[PDB]
Ligand binder design. Structure first.
Ligand SMILES: [Mg+2]
Ligand SMILES: [Mg+2]
Ligand SMILES: [Mg+2]
Ligand SMILES: [Mg+2]
Lengths: 289, 289, 289, 289
């Protein structure tokens, strides 16, 4: 039997600074695979904004995410790392079901963060985080729920923005000691900080190189020098895809024809090639006739 | 109670040549609405190639389509026309369940075509179509299943490529006579053909202006002169979005950073604006405090 | 367009003490309809223990419940009251999505309660309830989210066991004042208490006559004398069904045949009659031939 | 990694006449497990009549079945054999997706039959079957799609009723030679017939001991003597559960109280025990405190 988790860990071994790109849907997972990537990502913010057209305010449910996990892993063999936010539910039972369901859906790993989420019905969108102790319990529940020993439980901390660097590092160490297998320090502002986390936990470090945020657009070489194990680009393709779609919609609405934007489109031939369209009639010939 | 079907019919009245753009996901449905469109489309080929990463060979299930219908209509109020292929089943019972399920999922209408399908396990893809009599039953079952009288049952015919113009028109009349409320003559090659269909059925006619196909890129004005009621652009934005995504994946892989393609990305402000991000905290302020 | 919520409200009018029976699945919803009932219920504890085989500890997700709502209402026309627990999320945004999703799924109404929930990962099950103020917001968000004005928002309070009668009544009035359309005072022990709630809120009151609990098995006549508007039997059939199933499994295991328990089984004719089997070929004859 | 298929094959080795009982939902799977069964079953007729309240006329979709597969296998470790009817779709691609999806959903095996299904929109419910050649292709597609070598592909033939015994046996041999791993001869009328199939295919034979059909209620001893490998009781518990539920609904409607039927109900304590209610707080104590 195949273990996507094993595949993720193997990818980390063969690619210093393992590049992991977010894939908004199954089609883009195939594009990323054809582009040469060894691992892909399912952004929680992407499931919300892309699949549901909703803001990343914790409105998405576990099932909205599972559906996307199944769609991508049903057709793409690359190991998929999944954004599990805070475990979809406050109970250890909720965290456990999330872990087991994502593994069953085909995911190679997931990251769970220390954010609080909504504490009250009228609680405004926020970046507040739970105590170190609460997150350790969250992590313990997630690790204990692993049905595939090679599935990866990555812990993410958003403590930098609300507690500063030293506190974030201290939390990170407690998270790893609790069982976290990899560390994801969110919104790091300086390259040297990644190195500090690396020397502090002794486990693979992921750097979220998303755009328009607090983190600079560090190159793979810069991240390698800082001992970063993974380079994540969570919504990069999604952002470009949206601009391109918007432009088509506008031109079509403005001019009553798409003539002016044909040159910006993936061709029919390219689409077929991307979805291994020909591997289908080939299988038919191999099985019959 | 709101009826998307009623809204779709209304849209036809306030827009000669009603533009209908395919929306691959909920996010794009919101982009189309922000672009001023009054009706959107869920491409069957888009669900397959985009949501599932599979070719358009009838591998998609009713449920794959239902999921996209709900995701889109749960957040976008524009009426959604859905590609229902042949009804997802060979029995009148399947056609009925498909119709009722799509209505409940939130669709404003759907089109069912006269293609035969697979039939045999090792059957090769084709353009073969069922008998006029067979399609008539297919339509009768679909119309009978409507739980919302305003939901639209559109009949699509692929008879041109396999039976010729005169044959396709004969079928059309029979289809409409059977209850088809709108007509979708596929792969028309000449503008004058549309006019012929229009004069023959007396029901709104849809023109599928998809690229890289057999149909010229007719403008809305040209279509209006041919008495076309709807201009459909099924995968236009999808094609541009894939090309843009692919570009990001390649540049990122080749240069170790996305710096070079930032200018091709939708900004954070644009993303937030497009998903009505601000309306969320505004609702919290209106409800509480 | 049909409104289940409107139908539910109508049912209350044609049945003093409106009997509402829990239906574990679609098949049982049809049995209840054939038994003459005018309203049915989807127990949250039933979804957990029956559909998921899990205890009622908040492990079930909104989607587990939505699936059962669709299955039941796609085939049974009776108005379905749904147990929505605390809204499946702590934010007003979750409450809103739950409401809108359940309406679209086909429900006629739902009840949300004032229980706190887990809050912490290692938190133990309890009967703790949020503040009166907190529940009020929960209700305001739910009512504001209604897409069908006739959909029912019922408020349930578990304040008796933890705060006493006088406290529970105070909350009730505040809840109704906040928009709660009907009231569900949980685990009432005395018939006279129901009358007190009824006289205090001026909205329909529901009595949860579930077995093996703190509430006596009050008859419909007794409840009518206490001004109870609805008599709920949440898992009654489920409990009998499990005992009967267990019997078959044991006898079959012990005797190597089911011969001995055939007389405890619904016959083939009864099954067909209950799922309107015959209506199917009758539709084929009416539509075709 | 665990393989339910391996578990099914192992169960066959340790239990001559392996008893396999149908479990309508997750809860009943746990009851069957506590009753001592080593393997369980997901009836397609049960998914239709029980989960959807629909007749077994091919209206159910693959996803309706997958949902039930996930629900049962998420909580019960017993290997689950699944009714896959004819593969949900006429294409080899449809059969393949069905196989891969069911394996991913957690199933241990499935049986696919040689029925035709609906060949026309107005095709009445029928028992017609495809040619031997067509079924062989169906089987080849299913076996080739196996992602877990231990997953079981069982072929079922309904040829007895429309072609007689000799033809059914001939088909069976062709089905096994095509790759079928186990054989399911539907509606066998005589014990000696099972022995004939057994000697003819050299692979495990399953006897569908459902009630109210053409097959006598053969005991495990009788089946053992006929060399039957598995004894299936597809809807036995379901039938009893329905009668029990119906009775509760009737008494409640007739008498306005469930007092008279309390003795027919599984108690609250028994319900908790069945769903290992206590294993939950035990896990909390083991993980925390
Ligand atoms: Mg997030
Ligand atoms: Mg199509
Ligand atoms: Mg509850
Ligand atoms: Mg069947």
């Amino acid at each position: 039997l195949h273990s996507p988790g094993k595949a993720f860990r193997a990818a980390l071994t063969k690619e210093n600074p393992l590049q992991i790109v977010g894939t908004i849907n199954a089609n883009h997972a195939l594009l990323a695979q054809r582009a040469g990537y060894q691992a892909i990502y399912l952004s929680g913010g992407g499931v919300a904004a892309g699949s549901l057209g909703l803001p990343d305010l914790g409105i998405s449910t576990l099932d909205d995410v599972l559906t996307d996990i199944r769609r991508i892993t049903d057709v793409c063999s690359l190991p998929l790392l999944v954004d599990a936010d805070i475990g979809f539910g406050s109970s250890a039972f909720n965290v456990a079901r999330t872990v087991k369901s994502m593994i069953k859906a085909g995911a190679a790993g997931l990251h769970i963060e220390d954010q609080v989420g909504a504490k009250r019905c009228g609680h405004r969108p926020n970046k507040a985080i739970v105590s170190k102790e609460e997150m350790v319990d969250r992590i313990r529940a997630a690790v204990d729920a692993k049905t595939d020993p090679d599935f990866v439980i990555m812990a993410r901390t958003d403590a930098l923005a609300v507690e500063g660097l030293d506190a974030a590092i201290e939390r990170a160490q407690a998270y790893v000691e609790a069982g976290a297998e990899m560390l994801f320090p969110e919104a790091i502002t300086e390259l040297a900080m990644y190195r500090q986390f690396a020397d502090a936990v002794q486990v693979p470090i992921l750097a979220n190189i998303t755009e328009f945020g607090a983190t600079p657009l560090f190159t793979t070489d810069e991240l390698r020098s800082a001992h970063v194990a993974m380079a994540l680009y969570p919504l990069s393709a999604f952002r470009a895809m949206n601009r391109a779609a918007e432009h088509v919609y506008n031109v079509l609405r403005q001019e009553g024809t798409q003539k002016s934007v044909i040159d910006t489109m993936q061709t029919r031939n390219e689409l077929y090639e991307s979805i291994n369209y020909y591997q289908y009639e080939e299988k038919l010939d191999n099985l019959f006739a």
